[PDB]
Design brief:
Elements lengths: L3 E5 L14 E5 L4 E7 L14 E9 L2 H7 L1 H4 L6 E3 L8 E5 L6 E6 L6 E6 L10 E10 L5 E15 L3 H14 L3 H4 L9 E2 L1 E2 L7
């Protein structure tokens, strides 16, 4: 099935319709926890038992046409769009920030062990209010240390604000929903206290 689950520890907006993708507001530069979980039932991928996997994280534009045309705005002194807060992280092995892709980081982890990566996002949605996508692609190696066999990809939709802006936008969403009729409130999903990433197409290259 789906061998892993990734949980971004930030609440979703309460102003999204029932069956639409979640939207999560983040503050620029704030460390956010992403829990890396084994989602396998008994028996799946025993080759993973006792080995590590590699996850590659990207922050890209959520709209596909905007990503197709403006991807280089996020890719690239010392000005990164995505970074790993290594001192706060747990179970994060050999973390690396790609010096040529300022919106990409990677690390190894053991799905049998507690694993929480903390990330900071430094691009702001209004410097282009466009949504971004946090995407994770996860790989195994086959005995030569090359983590190149794709296992799983998932992603979530975010907007990033200058700090406190995410709290402000979440408050505006709450106060907008409070004004709506009962019959219209029913058409929206509640805010969830974490953001569970959902399966997506693999990134077209490793």
């Amino acid at each position: 099935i789906l061998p892993f689950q990734y949980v971004l520890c930030a609440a979703t907006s309460p102003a999204v319709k029932l069956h639409d993708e979640t939207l999560t507001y983040l503050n620029q530069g704030q460390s956010y926890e992403i829990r890396m979980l084994d989602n396998r039932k008994l028996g799946e991928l025993p080759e993973l038992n006792g080995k590590l996997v590699k996850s590659i994280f990207r922050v890209v534009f959520h709209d596909r046409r905007l990503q197709y045309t403006e991807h280089q705005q996020l890719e690239g002194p010392g000005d990164r769009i995505l970074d790993i807060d290594i001192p706060m992280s747990v179970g994060v092995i050999d973390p690396r920030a790609n010096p040529t892709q300022l919106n990409t980081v990677e690390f190894l982890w053991d799905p049998s062990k507690r694993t929480s990566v903390f990330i900071q996002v430094h691009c702001i949605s209004t410097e282009f209010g466009v949504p971004f996508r946090v995407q994770i692609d996860t790989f195994k190696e086959n005995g030569n240390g090359e983590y190149t066999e794709h296992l799983h990809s998932a992603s979530c939709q975010i907007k990033v604000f200058k700090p406190k802006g995410a709290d402000r936008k979440q408050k505006i969403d709450r106060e907008k929903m409070e004004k709506r009729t009962p019959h219209e409130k029913e058409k929206y999903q509640p805010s969830y206290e974490t953001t569970i990433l959902t399966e997506c197409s693999p990134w077209p290259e490793i």
